[PDB]
Amino acid sequence: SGTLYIVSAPSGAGKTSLVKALLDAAPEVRVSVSHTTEVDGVNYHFFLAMLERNEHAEVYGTSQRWVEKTLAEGLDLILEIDWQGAQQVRRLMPEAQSIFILPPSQEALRQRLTNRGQDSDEVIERRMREAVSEMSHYVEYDHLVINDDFAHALDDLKAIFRARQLRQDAQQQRHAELLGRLLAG
Amino acid sequence: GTLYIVSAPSGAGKTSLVKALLDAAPEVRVSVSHTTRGMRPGEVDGVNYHFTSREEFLAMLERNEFLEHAEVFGNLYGTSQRWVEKTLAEGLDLILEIDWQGAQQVRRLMPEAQSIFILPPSQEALRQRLTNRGQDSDEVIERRMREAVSEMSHYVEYDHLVINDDFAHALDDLKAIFRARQLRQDAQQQRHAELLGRLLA
Amino acid sequence: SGTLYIVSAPSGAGKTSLVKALLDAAPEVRVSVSHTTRGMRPGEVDGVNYHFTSREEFLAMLERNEFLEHAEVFGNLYGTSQRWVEKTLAEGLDLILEIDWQGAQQVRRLMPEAQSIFILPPSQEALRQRLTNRGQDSDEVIERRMREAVSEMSHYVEYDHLVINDDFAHALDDLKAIFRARQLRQDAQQQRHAELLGRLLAG
Amino acid sequence: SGTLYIVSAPSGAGKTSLVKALLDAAPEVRVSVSHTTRGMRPGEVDGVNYHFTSREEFLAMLERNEFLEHAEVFGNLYGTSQRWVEKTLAEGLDLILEIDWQGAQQVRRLMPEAQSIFILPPSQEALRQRLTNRGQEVIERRMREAVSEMSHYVEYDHLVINDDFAHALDDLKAIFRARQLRQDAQQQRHAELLGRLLA
Amino acid sequence: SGTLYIVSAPSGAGKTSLVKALLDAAPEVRVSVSHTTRGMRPGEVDGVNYHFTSREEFLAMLERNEFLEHAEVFGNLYGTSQRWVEKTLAEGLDLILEIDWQGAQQVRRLMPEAQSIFILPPSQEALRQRLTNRGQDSDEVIERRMREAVSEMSHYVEYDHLVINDDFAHALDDLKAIFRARQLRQDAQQQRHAELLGRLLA
Amino acid sequence: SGTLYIVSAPSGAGKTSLVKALLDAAPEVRVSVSHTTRGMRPGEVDGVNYHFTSREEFLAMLERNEFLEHAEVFGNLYGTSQRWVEKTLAEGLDLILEIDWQGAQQVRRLMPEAQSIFILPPSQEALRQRLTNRRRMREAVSEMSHYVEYDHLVINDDFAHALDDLKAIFRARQLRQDAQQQRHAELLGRLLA
């Protein structure tokens, strides 16, 4: 069986860039396709009536069907969700692992938001007003990655995922046969 | 700092993997156990072990100076409690290279202790490594091989398992565990308290 | 001249993923685009993953002796174009053939200097799980290939090197070491560093 | 069993330092302690770097057929103990012989499975700098023979160019890891995994 | 403020693939999309590899003084948009110009703090093989570019750093080491860790 | 000709341990054995860690102009032997001087091509922890205030990351025109022939 990961970060901290690089070196890991209001089905399932017909939050929603089958197949799964979703998932599925990604400074956040070139010259300040409040939830997460130097932060992220696959539970499923041979007198 | 328990059947590679880990990790220390085992060729008293006699090991035990002690392969081993208390209080990380009996004692007293079990890729690999090390006779290698399955059966009591097949890959596995812990909420809050404060300011 | 590599594995072992990651760091290496009569998987592009053809046009290409090797694999035909292999090697490029054990045997007979690497899973269940998790094949196809998995893996004894693809990053390093070690052989080093060697022995 | 390696190089190419770094990361690899009829260098320890013996005890050891190979390198005699090599391989350990081209030819005759690696400098002048900068007259005797030593590079399975040390160390590690990935080594090391895969 | 990098190389040395590999691991670094009059080879997208325009639109852009530098390379016009460079450096981003030696000299005059890196092949023949292996140049053009190879490579003396692109991965590491050492300079470390440094001196 | 490096740091920042790890992977690099009037430390060997002499023999060595630089640090005299530096550089080896900011200024005057690196801790308490776990703390801020005088700054937070930073500085310096022109003269000649 696989691990459920929650990855959260303020916009522009580097969560998208770190996860994409993590996936390139981690074939057993998938990323959940959120529904939100780019390619439909790849980045997101791109309305409210279908959503009301059945975690979810306004800041967006995570499809429940994909998660259940994926974990039972042994795949690890990353949810790129906000603190509201993280709280919902942690309540419904307490075994979920949570990782928070933070910038080295508030100004680096603004520079990255501005340098990404996807938001407006005022939405950067609109998102920054909520950025300090959003980052305050870092205390609710199992691990913290400070995305200063990208390469080091990628290593930090890979170490979390590798250490997790080395846990007792994961090693028992993946290396069951080796463990059996080791104890076979 | 963090207290680590590293255990393994005799000859899995626990000593050599930890030695290499320390070369890149000055903030981590390894505890020097007391033993009544006889010195191996190439071993130095005070570095690898505190080589003491049985009468004084038991004298040290009667003074309750041991955080844990156990009988392993017919010899007495124990961890000095004073050295552990001071080392953790200075902020250094600390590795105990002890058996499952010591591991259980330590886990009861310090539930936050992190435990790692190192496994060989096969049983025969243990005998080969014990033989290739060349520090132990055949009577000792055959005594430890009989208990090897018994030693490995406690692996289910450990937080993480490292399979020491290829040395460099297993060192990477080990470094990933130590790095993931240093990235936990508690460690990150202590280490980056000032940076975190500026972020919420 | 470049080196011809044969990379084989039971379906779902990770051979395509490992080779793709190898190529991102290895510009001197090319991978052969095989012909197949199989239908496309979701996300496959004609000319990139395979040259998709009909049975008829495959057998016509075969009657013209345009295949270095060919084989029937899980009910479909696959084959390596001979012209492309010859031209690439003569340019000094290294070349990977991602082919089955039947094709590998044909290539070894025609080109004895070819290097072969076999990629094994850590378990049989790992193959089924990886085939299922890739999501490009149906269930009947997966079961059909899993039925032959033990028979397929039995040919590992015919290969020069074995890579156990347990941890992907570790298996990628193992693969890079085989390639890097081949480029350090006497022949490759003599061709690539002919001038430096000449400077070294001149008094 | 393990792999027998022959590592050769003109004096000062970096063979000892590259092997030392390789040994620090490769516990399954041992390096042979050769016998020599030579005087220690500042820092050398008898039994670690060499078995320092006289020319009398060397030829007597030779007459007893105790050497796997022997050769004269600058009038000084060097040789590898056959007992030590035979014992180490049978335990499954890999073994490095740091010997010249003469020993390599002898070992290749007795053990065709031996792997040979020749370590080259980026230039002839870099050889002089490394010989001089290390800190052990002989350089002029060895530099005349350096071209002679390097000309035998054509006899070796692999060539490592020791230009940048770290890159040359990676090159060296790639050879050793690729060798452990060969059919024979993998068959011994993962016999149990292979059995489960075919069952 | 970010750092301006000039990366140059004779055709086929490996400059495009080495920078592409460096960028995949370095999000704080951007590469300038030059304007060119050359024809759009397959696989290239206007706005991705180049801003493909005609000679007429290029010279009109030049008359509007919208280029930081421009040069004729192998009969076509190439140029770096000055507005994009100025804004990108002012945002604190690092910037690579993959330009020839002519553009590099122009950039050095207007921006003497620009960092320049020259990439070299391990041999002239390796250059010919790589041009042939890339498969995007007639044999006539290859023979012509090899005639200019020695003249082009002679400009290596104008560059701060030389990377010999022999083994790709080793040359990629060399390049990353240059970039990492630059971000460790007094000025860069002072800007990025100004607050941490303040805590140290209190 | 090799490169002369100046590596400085407040006491306990990690300069000696980082340089030791760098040297294990850099055989072309040497570290200068300074003269000092301080007494031997745990495990210190005369000629290895320092050339331990007395204040009287140090000042005599100074009057003979045998030093490249000298300074009083924390109440003890320290100095670099000039002959060893000159010979080492002329042999083509790179050279590290583990000296304080006073020595760094003297060396920069005599050899302005010297590369200087300052190693900083992640926090002021980390120094106390590193010094304690392994008087100077009051002067630590004073020593660190000279960081502005150095070409490169390495923040020794995570040891392995700081080691990588240090290796990148040394590797980039060997990628400079002057260094590459000396080291690959024959290759460059072959390319331009």
Ligand SMILES: Nc1ncnc2c1ncn2[C@@H]1O[C@H](COP(=O)(O)OP(=O)(O)O)[C@@H](O)[C@H]1O
């Ligand atoms: N460590 C880093 N240093 C500098 N820029 C970075 C770093 N990591 C990411 N970036 C850049 O910051 C911007 C925001 O990153 P992104 O992952 O898209 O944000 P988000 O956290 O909202 O998913 C991008 O342009 C990215 O390239």
Ligand SMILES: Nc1ncnc2c1ncn2[C@@H]1O[C@H](COP(=O)(O)OP(=O)(O)O)[C@@H](O)[C@H]1O
């Ligand atoms: N992955 C490995 N492969 C082969 N030999 C190894 C490996 N790891 C360690 N060794 C060797 O096995 C022997 C036993 O290792 P050691 O750490 O001393 O055992 P222990 O687990 O009892 O502390 C040593 O000679 C060591 O060098």
Ligand SMILES: Nc1ncnc2c1ncn2[C@@H]1O[C@H](COP(=O)(O)OP(=O)(O)O)[C@@H](O)[C@H]1O
């Ligand atoms: N070591 C691994 N662990 C888990 N999944 C892996 C590993 N290597 C590859 N995979 C995944 O297994 C699936 C099958 O891999 P692929 O290379 O396409 O198979 P094939 O060997 O048939 O070419 C893919 O989804 C791939 O991402």
Ligand SMILES: Nc1ncnc2c1ncn2[C@@H]1O[C@H](COP(=O)(O)OP(=O)(O)O)[C@@H](O)[C@H]1O
């Ligand atoms: N790649 C290298 N570049 C520069 N100096 C090196 C390199 N490798 C080794 N050296 C140095 O060259 C000298 C000769 O190395 P050594 O291993 O002792 O020589 P040998 O090849 O004769 O065994 C030593 O001082 C060593 O530190």
Ligand SMILES: Nc1ncnc2c1ncn2[C@@H]1O[C@H](COP(=O)(O)OP(=O)(O)O)[C@@H](O)[C@H]1O
């Ligand atoms: N070190 C290398 N060894 C072999 N081939 C390489 C190396 N680096 C790049 N190549 C290949 O050489 C060709 C030319 O590289 P490219 O970057 O496109 O050239 P340019 O220098 O003109 O930008 C490409 O096919 C590339 O994959």
Ligand SMILES: Nc1ncnc2c1ncn2[C@@H]1O[C@H](COP(=O)(O)OP(=O)(O)O)[C@@H](O)[C@H]1O
């Ligand atoms: N990054 C680090 N994190 C934690 N401890 C470190 C780090 N780097 C070095 N140390 C330790 O700090 C102590 C002081 O290091 P050292 O190099 O001896 O100091 P100095 O800068 O005075 O030469 C040593 O015990 C060393 O192992």
Ligand SMILES: Nc1nc2c(ncn2[C@@H]2O[C@H](COP(=O)(O)O)[C@@H](O)[C@H]2O)c(=O)[nH]1
């Ligand atoms: N709760 C929840 N948050 C999501 C989901 N998908 C994205 N988000 C969050 O929505 C925020 C805005 O992201 P963006 O606007 O770039 O798409 C991010 O913080 C992201 O983590 C989802 O499925 N559920």
Ligand SMILES: Nc1nc2c(ncn2[C@@H]2O[C@H](COP(=O)(O)O)[C@@H](O)[C@H]2O)c(=O)[nH]1
């Ligand atoms: N409980 C306990 N076990 C120890 C201690 N020191 C070493 N051991 C264990 O004793 C066993 C025998 O080790 P050896 O004789 O090879 O040194 C190993 O499993 C080792 O981990 C100690 O202080 N306490």
Ligand SMILES: Nc1nc2c(ncn2[C@@H]2O[C@H](COP(=O)(O)O)[C@@H](O)[C@H]2O)c(=O)[nH]1
């Ligand atoms: N003989 C041969 N086998 C091939 C060729 N191309 C693919 N195969 C093999 O056919 C099998 C099925 O591959 P698939 O349909 O999953 O892509 C794999 O083992 C693959 O290596 C080819 O050109 N020749």
Ligand SMILES: Nc1nc2c(ncn2[C@@H]2O[C@H](COP(=O)(O)O)[C@@H](O)[C@H]2O)c(=O)[nH]1
């Ligand atoms: N044939 C042979 N050569 C040796 C032996 N030991 C060292 N050599 C070679 O003797 C030469 C001189 O080495 P040195 O004097 O620096 O130790 C080197 O080329 C080294 O490889 C040995 O046992 N046999």
Ligand SMILES: Nc1nc2c(ncn2[C@@H]2O[C@H](COP(=O)(O)O)[C@@H](O)[C@H]2O)c(=O)[nH]1
């Ligand atoms: N001066 C200048 N040269 C450029 C520019 N863009 C590309 N080049 C150079 O033009 C040459 C031809 O490149 P290509 O035709 O392969 O894209 C290369 O040397 C490349 O570095 C530019 O904006 N300015």
Ligand SMILES: Nc1nc2c(ncn2[C@@H]2O[C@H](COP(=O)(O)O)[C@@H](O)[C@H]2O)c(=O)[nH]1
């Ligand atoms: N100027 C100068 N400072 C030195 C020299 N050797 C050591 N130091 C500095 O003296 C200080 C005290 O170092 P320690 O007492 O731990 O050896 C350190 O900052 C060290 O850099 C030297 O030769 N010259």
